[PDB]
Design a protein around this nucleic acid. Structure first.
Ligand SMILES: [Mg+2]
Ligand SMILES: [Mg+2]
Ligand SMILES: [Mg+2]
Ligand SMILES: [Mg+2]
Ligand SMILES: [Mg+2]
Ligand SMILES: [Mg+2]
Ligand SMILES: [Mg+2]
Ligand SMILES: [Mg+2]
Ligand SMILES: [Mg+2]
Ligand SMILES: [Mg+2]
Ligand SMILES: [Mg+2]
Ligand SMILES: [Mg+2]
Ligand SMILES: [Mg+2]
Ligand SMILES: [Mg+2]
Ligand SMILES: [Mg+2]
Ligand SMILES: [Mg+2]
Ligand SMILES: [Mg+2]
Ligand SMILES: [Mg+2]
Ligand SMILES: [Mg+2]
Ligand SMILES: [Mg+2]
Ligand SMILES: [Mg+2]
Ligand SMILES: [Mg+2]
Ligand SMILES: [Mg+2]
Ligand SMILES: [Mg+2]
Ligand SMILES: [Mg+2]
Ligand SMILES: [Mg+2]
Ligand SMILES: [Mg+2]
Ligand SMILES: [Mg+2]
Ligand SMILES: [Mg+2]
Ligand SMILES: [Mg+2]
Ligand SMILES: [Mg+2]
Ligand SMILES: [Mg+2]
Ligand SMILES: [Mg+2]
Ligand SMILES: [Mg+2]
Ligand SMILES: [Mg+2]
Ligand SMILES: [Mg+2]
Ligand SMILES: [Mg+2]
Ligand SMILES: [Mg+2]
Ligand SMILES: [Mg+2]
Ligand SMILES: [Mg+2]
Ligand SMILES: [Mg+2]
Ligand SMILES: [Mg+2]
Ligand SMILES: [Mg+2]
Ligand SMILES: [Mg+2]
Ligand SMILES: [Mg+2]
Ligand SMILES: [Mg+2]
Ligand SMILES: [Mg+2]
Ligand SMILES: [Mg+2]
Ligand SMILES: [Mg+2]
Ligand SMILES: [Mg+2]
Ligand SMILES: [Mg+2]
Ligand SMILES: [Mg+2]
Ligand SMILES: [Mg+2]
Ligand SMILES: [Mg+2]
Ligand SMILES: [Mg+2]
Ligand SMILES: [Mg+2]
Ligand SMILES: [Mg+2]
Ligand SMILES: [Mg+2]
Ligand SMILES: [Mg+2]
Ligand SMILES: [Mg+2]
Ligand SMILES: [Mg+2]
Ligand SMILES: [Mg+2]
Ligand SMILES: [Mg+2]
Ligand SMILES: [Mg+2]
Ligand SMILES: [Mg+2]
Ligand SMILES: [Mg+2]
Ligand SMILES: [Mg+2]
Ligand SMILES: [Mg+2]
Ligand SMILES: [Mg+2]
Ligand SMILES: [Mg+2]
Ligand SMILES: [Mg+2]
Ligand SMILES: [Mg+2]
Ligand SMILES: [Mg+2]
Ligand SMILES: [Mg+2]
Ligand SMILES: [Mg+2]
Ligand SMILES: [Mg+2]
Ligand SMILES: [Mg+2]
Ligand SMILES: [Mg+2]
Ligand SMILES: [Mg+2]
Ligand SMILES: [Mg+2]
Ligand SMILES: [Mg+2]
Ligand SMILES: [Mg+2]
Ligand SMILES: [Mg+2]
Ligand SMILES: [Mg+2]
Ligand SMILES: [Mg+2]
Ligand SMILES: [Mg+2]
Ligand SMILES: [Mg+2]
Ligand SMILES: [Mg+2]
Ligand SMILES: [Mg+2]
Ligand SMILES: [Mg+2]
Ligand SMILES: [Mg+2]
Ligand SMILES: [Mg+2]
Ligand SMILES: [Mg+2]
Ligand SMILES: [Mg+2]
Ligand SMILES: [Mg+2]
Ligand SMILES: [Mg+2]
Ligand SMILES: [Mg+2]
Ligand SMILES: [Mg+2]
Ligand SMILES: [Mg+2]
Ligand SMILES: [Mg+2]
Ligand SMILES: [Mg+2]
Ligand SMILES: [Mg+2]
Ligand SMILES: [Mg+2]
Ligand SMILES: [Mg+2]
Ligand SMILES: [Mg+2]
Ligand SMILES: [Mg+2]
Ligand SMILES: [Mg+2]
Ligand SMILES: [Mg+2]
Ligand SMILES: [Mg+2]
Ligand SMILES: [Mg+2]
Ligand SMILES: [Mg+2]
Ligand SMILES: [Mg+2]
Ligand SMILES: [Mg+2]
Ligand SMILES: [Mg+2]
Ligand SMILES: [Mg+2]
Ligand SMILES: [Mg+2]
Ligand SMILES: [Mg+2]
Ligand SMILES: [Mg+2]
Ligand SMILES: [Mg+2]
Ligand SMILES: [Mg+2]
Ligand SMILES: [Mg+2]
Ligand SMILES: [Mg+2]
Ligand SMILES: [Mg+2]
Ligand SMILES: [Mg+2]
Ligand SMILES: [Mg+2]
Ligand SMILES: [Mg+2]
Ligand SMILES: [Mg+2]
Ligand SMILES: [Mg+2]
Ligand SMILES: [Mg+2]
Ligand SMILES: [Mg+2]
Ligand SMILES: [Mg+2]
Ligand SMILES: [Mg+2]
Ligand SMILES: [Mg+2]
Ligand SMILES: [Mg+2]
Ligand SMILES: [Mg+2]
Ligand SMILES: [Mg+2]
Ligand SMILES: [Mg+2]
Ligand SMILES: [Mg+2]
Ligand SMILES: [Mg+2]
Ligand SMILES: [Mg+2]
Ligand SMILES: [Mg+2]
Ligand SMILES: [Mg+2]
Ligand SMILES: [Mg+2]
Ligand SMILES: [Mg+2]
Ligand SMILES: [Mg+2]
Ligand SMILES: [Mg+2]
Ligand SMILES: [Mg+2]
Ligand SMILES: [Mg+2]
Ligand SMILES: [Mg+2]
Ligand SMILES: [Mg+2]
Ligand SMILES: [Mg+2]
Ligand SMILES: [Mg+2]
Ligand SMILES: [Mg+2]
Ligand SMILES: [Mg+2]
Ligand SMILES: [Mg+2]
Ligand SMILES: [Mg+2]
Ligand SMILES: [Mg+2]
Ligand SMILES: [Mg+2]
Ligand SMILES: [Mg+2]
Ligand SMILES: [Mg+2]
Ligand SMILES: [Mg+2]
Ligand SMILES: [Mg+2]
Ligand SMILES: [Mg+2]
Ligand SMILES: [Mg+2]
Ligand SMILES: [Mg+2]
Ligand SMILES: [Mg+2]
Ligand SMILES: [Mg+2]
Ligand SMILES: [Mg+2]
Ligand SMILES: [Mg+2]
Ligand SMILES: [Mg+2]
Ligand SMILES: [Mg+2]
Ligand SMILES: [Mg+2]
Ligand SMILES: [Mg+2]
Ligand SMILES: [Mg+2]
Ligand SMILES: [Mg+2]
Ligand SMILES: [Mg+2]
Ligand SMILES: [Mg+2]
Ligand SMILES: [Mg+2]
Ligand SMILES: [Mg+2]
Ligand SMILES: [Mg+2]
Ligand SMILES: [Mg+2]
Ligand SMILES: [Mg+2]
Ligand SMILES: [Mg+2]
Ligand SMILES: [Mg+2]
Ligand SMILES: [Mg+2]
Ligand SMILES: [Mg+2]
Ligand SMILES: [Mg+2]
Ligand SMILES: [Mg+2]
Ligand SMILES: [Mg+2]
Ligand SMILES: [Mg+2]
Ligand SMILES: [Mg+2]
Ligand SMILES: [Mg+2]
Lengths: 47, 272
RNA sequence: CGGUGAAAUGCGCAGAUACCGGGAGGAACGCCGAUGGCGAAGGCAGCCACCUGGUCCACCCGUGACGCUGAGGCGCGAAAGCG
RNA sequence: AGCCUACGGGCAGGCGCCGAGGGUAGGGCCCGUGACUGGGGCGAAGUCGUAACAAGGUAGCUGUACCGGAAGGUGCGGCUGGA
RNA sequence: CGCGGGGUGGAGCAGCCUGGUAGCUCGUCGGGCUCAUAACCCGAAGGUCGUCGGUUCAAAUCCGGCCCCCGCAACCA
RNA sequence: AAUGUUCC
RNA sequence: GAGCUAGCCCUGGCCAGGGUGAAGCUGGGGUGAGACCCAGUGGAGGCCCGAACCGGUGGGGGAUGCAAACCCCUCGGAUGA
RNA sequence: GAAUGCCGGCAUGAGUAACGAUAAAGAGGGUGAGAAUCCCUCUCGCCGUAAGCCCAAGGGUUCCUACGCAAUGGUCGUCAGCGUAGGGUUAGGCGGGACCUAAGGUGAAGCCGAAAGGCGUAGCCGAAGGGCAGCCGGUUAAUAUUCCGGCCCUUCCCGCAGGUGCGAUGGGGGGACGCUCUAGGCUAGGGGGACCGGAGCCAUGGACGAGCCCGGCCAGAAGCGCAGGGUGGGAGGUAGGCAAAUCCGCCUCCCAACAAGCUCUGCGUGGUGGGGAAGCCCGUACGGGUGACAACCCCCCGAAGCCAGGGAGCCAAGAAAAGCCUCUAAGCACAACCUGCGGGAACCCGUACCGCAAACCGACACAGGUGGGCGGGUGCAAGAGCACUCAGGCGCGCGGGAGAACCCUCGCCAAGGAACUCUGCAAGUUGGCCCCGUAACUUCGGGAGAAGGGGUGCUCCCUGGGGUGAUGAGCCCCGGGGAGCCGCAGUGAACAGGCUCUGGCGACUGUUUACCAAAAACACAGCUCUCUGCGAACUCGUAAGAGGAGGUAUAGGGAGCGACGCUUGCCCGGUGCCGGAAGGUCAAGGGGAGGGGUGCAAGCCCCGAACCGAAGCCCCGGUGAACGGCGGCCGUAACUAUAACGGUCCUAAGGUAGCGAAAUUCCUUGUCGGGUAAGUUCCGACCUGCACGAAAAGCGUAACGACCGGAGCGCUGUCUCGGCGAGGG
RNA sequence: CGAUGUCGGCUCGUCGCAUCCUGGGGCUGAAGAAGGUCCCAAGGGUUGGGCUGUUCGCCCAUUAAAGCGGCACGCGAGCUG
């Protein structure tokens, strides 16, 4: 049947995107941990 | 003259539709200082507040002249009687002689092509508007303001009316549709005559979906719920409430008054 | 205080009954009024106005037997009752 | 495809429509019966009350509606078969 | 066989808790009113307190043991 | 302020 | 974290084909005027049968499966909540 | 040495199950070291409202070509969606952005919050919505509405030539809107044709013939023509459109009443341009040449699409903004705007490929899921159904044998026909269309497809309507009548209800436990109670604010009951709710009689009784469609039996109507009656209701039900009681 | 209790005898027939339906008889539910 993942470039960049992170003080801490750890991809890749 | 239906399918033996003969030949609405976009919404910024609103047919908000002191002494010709989905009452298109086109909430007995004017001069004929202090005692009236210069806010549902019972100083005493006796300031405007479409009480919605057409979602009783959701709920089958009857929030719903006691409007109220 | 044959229930020391002044609302219209009138029956009673029916008298003016009753039908139909 | 005495005929034979009745199914009317149940009539001396007839001890009767073991009581309106 | 409550004149109930004396209503009997009955009025009689024991000077009353009556309970797989 | 067995 | 799911807002789309024939019109009839009655027209409906679509009633299979909810037969709704 | 310990490796099961839909394969010839799997040909089978074609999302090189098989491929593999390398995606007109707004997000001013932050008119962002200028062919191995060819357009900028008071983010018009059913005329698509064009064929008994087979088209400015859609024209007066207006609106006179006239679409035709089968010949994976000076004509059906903003009916009353037209103000009128014609300028991104699937979501080449458009023909009444089939695409990435039990999926059966069993669970019967015919009941609609039947093919003859057509032929829809033929059998295959009687429950259509429960549960119109006079009541939030609602007692919130019919009796003693300027109690505070500690003293500092002190509670009342409750014992009648009646105790009051061994009943398979040969179930009664009962509603109720219970008929492998056959294992 | 699936039915049985029938025998208040009771005996057999989920039980129509029990109230890596 219909599974959980029904992808959308529109939704993924607005929910998890970089500009979505910086609006919240929560999301600013999200990147701040990911810079600290050393992620190559701070945000998920949208093309 | 309420239309009945032959019982050709079930829920049409009871289904009941109001008479539309008083609607003159004006089915499309006017524009240009007439409808705004009406935002349908069951809820505030976020969560639901008034539960079980939703659905419903799409509507356009006919903007209504509740404040008819704008055009004192200026007469009007009743152009048309139109349908309003936003209201129980009907609405009357008015062409002013001045040139404006506004709607007034259509009173009872008003016919097409009748002169109508607002102000202090304003002779006592159905549709005209006056201060309350200039209206004779005992006349039925509607669209009454509460405080002056704030808009018509009283007695404007279908077939409603307020009756003047007397004067006292700068205030007049009204018999409201609730039966409450209320002191209202004399300068508050008010439009004489009852509202009409009085047969709106006699409609029978017939089936379930006509409530969904109006925008009324299904309503779930408390005793059909579980006790997390409602006080009445739970219980192995059909418990008889076991407690004084309450809301989902705990406040009782059989006889509990909740008017704010220390309200400054208390000393203008005489009756229930 | 009410109330009865006499009482009691009840109402009242939180201000009752009896009084005056003001306000709301509903129903029925005293005297006139009668052994009266009107209507086919049921029935109809403060007053005003509108609409409207039956009826009686005078003049003997016109039609010219157009009349009487009425199975069914149709309409009215106190009070109580139903939506 | 038979038989015949006159053979562009008849008979035997075949086919078809109608057809008594039988079968299937569903209706109408009537009769008998049916656990139980409603009220009725009759039945020498059963039980409970007093409804009515004298203002029958609340005048009576009545249409309707409600109630009550029971007659009945009460309400609304009517009648004189009462003052 | 668990828990609680009850057995009182002929019928129905008190009085038990705080021991010393058993009362109310109907009924029964006698007499009044009536012509006679019922209603009503005046008198009166009637009770091993379920039994068996024992605590006390003393028991319907306090405590045990049986016999009946009423109510509750008798659940989990 | 209720009532009066059956037939004669 | 509402890209599954529940609800709602804004905007678009979809519903083969058959039936049943409500109101309303028009004509005739009827009456003092009506109510009303016949036809003919008309095409209403959380109407009917039934594909796409939406479901998941009963059974069978499947059970280290094609599948962490499937397949076959059957069945409900299908202009409406 | 053990902790169902951790990590790693290797065993056992075991050469076992499985190899992923039962749509199907066989042969010849190539290439190769190696072919059941790669290529070609021939034959067969499967899809064909797709298993074919075009988009959108998603995926990101998977597309094409060359070299190759270690690994992936459930086998093999020369093959590939795989490895290496090279190539390939071309836009003023397609889609998106230098245009607009909706929900929503953001947010100058402003409001709020310990901080973080939360609201918030205007503005801004925000799209399959609005607006906007391109159609047909041909080329590549891979792109094309993008390149090329033909034809046609749109913006700007600069010039000229002709016109006019021009001129705004401002006013107004317009854009601009539902559902259902429809009219007329077109088009897309399709069918036929003795007519036109065409290579070829006469087979096997017959036919050189109105013979067979294939094909008869697309686009196209101006101009015409055919259908439509839009809008009255003047003259005054004007206080409204937040300044003005010649525009809009309002009022009064005239002329039209129509589309007569302006426009604007659609469709034909149109200068012309392109395409152009079947067969044969070829050499490719795959395309080419000829057929071709190709023909390119006439009928008929005909849309859900177009003219579009068409019409009619109905209630639930059906977006905004910009583009566009007009009107004017600041400014200007050497400016500017409009029209025509020249020349010039016309940017950024996507463009391959799969796209109901082996390239998306499911760890997989997964029998699942995934939005839009085209989706041919014939026949079956119609149709997107069903069967066969064009175009097109596949035979599902393990096979060869054999023909045991057993299993799955099917097919048939004597005689009996539910005896099986919890239960006809399952399977069978019936099934489409047309025409007869159809009950109790009923809310007058229904029940109804009730039930129960009859016909259904082909040939010939006669005959009635329509439509396109000229009133005619033809072509196409509906019919009627009469003769006749064949088969066991005519919706001859496929798709296609078993029915009835009677209970319970729920009124009905609907909804739910994704993933064991679709129901008698939830919802539902409707009934009642209660709250709420607006800055409402209630909800969310600390607040601001917002929902309610741009609503106003015929409205909104909460609660129960759940159409409808007939009804909803008694108790306010306790709890709750409502009303009550008395009283009792009561906190902080007021007040300080008195008393205490210190000081030599004035003083400073503590406790502190009277009394005055709100809500709440006690107290007085009302309130049951508020929470709730609604008795026990004994006697009595002239056969017994029973009790209309009486006594007594208690309560706040002691279950009324209606129903009752029921979805309530323990004893209980209560006792009668019916159905049956036999009935713990069912149906109808009795009432001894352990323990119904009136809005946690009571008693009924036509219709409805994938609910639950009982019975009958029809029919059958459910069974007696098995047997045989087929395909996949 | 780091799991022993529990009623009833279906299929398959097998065993014990304190035997339902058939075989043999004693007594009988056994005339005969048909019975009663008791002993020996299990080799074989022990039906089909209605009701209930039923084991049991009650009936219908039969029969020579329509037996009682054990095997985890036999049997769910065999089925039903
Ligand atoms: Mg505008
Ligand atoms: Mg917001
Ligand atoms: Mg938010
Ligand atoms: Mg509800
Ligand atoms: Mg529940
Ligand atoms: Mg919750
Ligand atoms: Mg709670
Ligand atoms: Mg219960
Ligand atoms: Mg409760
Ligand atoms: Mg004369
Ligand atoms: Mg009357
Ligand atoms: Mg009356
Ligand atoms: Mg002859
Ligand atoms: Mg009879
Ligand atoms: Mg008397
Ligand atoms: Mg009397
Ligand atoms: Mg009397
Ligand atoms: Mg009385
Ligand atoms: Mg009287
Ligand atoms: Mg007198
Ligand atoms: Mg006692
Ligand atoms: Mg006692
Ligand atoms: Mg005596
Ligand atoms: Mg006496
Ligand atoms: Mg437990
Ligand atoms: Mg427990
Ligand atoms: Mg239990
Ligand atoms: Mg007597
Ligand atoms: Mg006597
Ligand atoms: Mg969602
Ligand atoms: Mg239809
Ligand atoms: Mg009609
Ligand atoms: Mg229809
Ligand atoms: Mg329907
Ligand atoms: Mg259907
Ligand atoms: Mg489709
Ligand atoms: Mg669902
Ligand atoms: Mg299923
Ligand atoms: Mg069906
Ligand atoms: Mg180890
Ligand atoms: Mg060790
Ligand atoms: Mg091994
Ligand atoms: Mg082997
Ligand atoms: Mg093995
Ligand atoms: Mg094996
Ligand atoms: Mg195998
Ligand atoms: Mg495979
Ligand atoms: Mg070779
Ligand atoms: Mg095929
Ligand atoms: Mg897209
Ligand atoms: Mg993409
Ligand atoms: Mg992938
Ligand atoms: Mg690659
Ligand atoms: Mg190669
Ligand atoms: Mg390989
Ligand atoms: Mg290599
Ligand atoms: Mg694989
Ligand atoms: Mg391999
Ligand atoms: Mg090779
Ligand atoms: Mg490739
Ligand atoms: Mg490659
Ligand atoms: Mg630019
Ligand atoms: Mg730019
Ligand atoms: Mg845009
Ligand atoms: Mg933009
Ligand atoms: Mg914008
Ligand atoms: Mg906005
Ligand atoms: Mg700040
Ligand atoms: Mg914000
Ligand atoms: Mg767009
Ligand atoms: Mg668009
Ligand atoms: Mg474009
Ligand atoms: Mg391509
Ligand atoms: Mg092209
Ligand atoms: Mg070009
Ligand atoms: Mg402009
Ligand atoms: Mg504008
Ligand atoms: Mg064409
Ligand atoms: Mg054509
Ligand atoms: Mg053709
Ligand atoms: Mg030819
Ligand atoms: Mg030949
Ligand atoms: Mg004009
Ligand atoms: Mg102005
Ligand atoms: Mg015209
Ligand atoms: Mg053309
Ligand atoms: Mg043209
Ligand atoms: Mg060619
Ligand atoms: Mg229109
Ligand atoms: Mg607008
Ligand atoms: Mg704007
Ligand atoms: Mg325009
Ligand atoms: Mg101008
Ligand atoms: Mg491309
Ligand atoms: Mg492409
Ligand atoms: Mg598709
Ligand atoms: Mg995949
Ligand atoms: Mg998976
Ligand atoms: Mg993959
Ligand atoms: Mg595969
Ligand atoms: Mg797949
Ligand atoms: Mg889906
Ligand atoms: Mg789909
Ligand atoms: Mg088609
Ligand atoms: Mg087709
Ligand atoms: Mg045929
Ligand atoms: Mg056809
Ligand atoms: Mg068909
Ligand atoms: Mg189609
Ligand atoms: Mg098909
Ligand atoms: Mg083919
Ligand atoms: Mg395979
Ligand atoms: Mg055969
Ligand atoms: Mg058979
Ligand atoms: Mg047979
Ligand atoms: Mg049979
Ligand atoms: Mg049976
Ligand atoms: Mg059996
Ligand atoms: Mg049974
Ligand atoms: Mg059954
Ligand atoms: Mg079945
Ligand atoms: Mg058949
Ligand atoms: Mg029925
Ligand atoms: Mg009918
Ligand atoms: Mg039939
Ligand atoms: Mg029926
Ligand atoms: Mg034939
Ligand atoms: Mg035509
Ligand atoms: Mg014609
Ligand atoms: Mg035949
Ligand atoms: Mg069939
Ligand atoms: Mg049934
Ligand atoms: Mg039923
Ligand atoms: Mg039952
Ligand atoms: Mg239901
Ligand atoms: Mg009911
Ligand atoms: Mg239905
Ligand atoms: Mg579930
Ligand atoms: Mg679950
Ligand atoms: Mg289910
Ligand atoms: Mg269901
Ligand atoms: Mg109701
Ligand atoms: Mg909030
Ligand atoms: Mg708060
Ligand atoms: Mg607000
Ligand atoms: Mg609002
Ligand atoms: Mg309400
Ligand atoms: Mg409400
Ligand atoms: Mg309910
Ligand atoms: Mg009825
Ligand atoms: Mg009640
Ligand atoms: Mg009470
Ligand atoms: Mg109370
Ligand atoms: Mg009280
Ligand atoms: Mg104090
Ligand atoms: Mg102090
Ligand atoms: Mg107080
Ligand atoms: Mg008594
Ligand atoms: Mg009572
Ligand atoms: Mg009973
Ligand atoms: Mg029987
Ligand atoms: Mg029986
Ligand atoms: Mg019964
Ligand atoms: Mg009970
Ligand atoms: Mg109940
Ligand atoms: Mg109740
Ligand atoms: Mg109910
Ligand atoms: Mg019932
Ligand atoms: Mg029923
Ligand atoms: Mg159902
Ligand atoms: Mg349903
Ligand atoms: Mg049976
Ligand atoms: Mg079998
Ligand atoms: Mg086989
Ligand atoms: Mg254990
Ligand atoms: Mg173990
Ligand atoms: Mg032995
Ligand atoms: Mg023997
Ligand atoms: Mg023997
Ligand atoms: Mg013998
Ligand atoms: Mg013997
Ligand atoms: Mg049976
Ligand atoms: Mg055994
Ligand atoms: Mg045992
Ligand atoms: Mg047992
Ligand atoms: Mg066992
Ligand atoms: Mg099992
Ligand atoms: Mg078992
Ligand atoms: Mg076992
Ligand atoms: Mg085992
Ligand atoms: Mg079960
Ligand atoms: Mg089951």
């Amino acid at each position: 049947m219909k599974r959980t993942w029904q992808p959308n470039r529109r939704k993924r960049a607005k929910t998890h995107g970089f500009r979505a992170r910086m609006r919240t003080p929560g999301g600013r801490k999200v990147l701040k941990r990911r810079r600290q750890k050393g992620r190559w991809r701070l945000t998920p890749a949208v093309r | 003259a309420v239309k009945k239906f032959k019982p050709y399918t079930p829920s049409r033996r009871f289904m009941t539709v109001a008479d539309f003969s008083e609607i003159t030949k004006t089915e499309p609405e006017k524009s240009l200082v007439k409808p705004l976009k009406k935002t349908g919404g069951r809820n505030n910024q976020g969560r639901i507040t008034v539960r079980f609103r939703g659905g419903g047919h799409k509507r356009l908000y006919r903007i209504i002249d509740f404040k008819r002191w704008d055009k004192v002494g200026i007469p009007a010709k009743v152009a048309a009687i139109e349908y309003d989905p936003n209201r129980s009452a009907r609405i009357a298109l008015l062409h002013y002689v001045d040139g404006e086109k506004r709607y007034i909430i259509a009173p009872d007995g008003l016919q097409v092509g009748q002169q109508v004017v607002a102000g202090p001069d304003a002779p006592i004929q159905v549709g005209n508007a006056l201060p309350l202090r200039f209206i004779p005692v005992g006349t039925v009236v509607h669209a009454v303001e509460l405080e002056p210069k704030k808009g018509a806010k009283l007695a404007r549902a279908a077939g409603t009316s307020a009756q003047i019972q007397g004067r006292e100083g700068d205030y007049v005493i009204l018999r409201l549709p609730s039966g409450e006796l209320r002191k209202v300031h004399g300068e508050c405007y008010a439009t004489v005559g009852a509202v009409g479409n009085a047969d709106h009480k006699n409609i029978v919605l017939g089936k379930a979906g006509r409530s969904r057409w109006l925008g009324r979602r299904p309503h779930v009783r408390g005793a059909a719920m579980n006790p997390v959701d409602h006080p009445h709920g739970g219980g192995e089958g059909r418990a008889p409430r076991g407690r004084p009857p309450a809301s989902p929030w705990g406040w009782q719903t059989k006889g509990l008054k909740t008017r704010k006691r220390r309200k400054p409007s208390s000393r203008f109220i005489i009756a229930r």
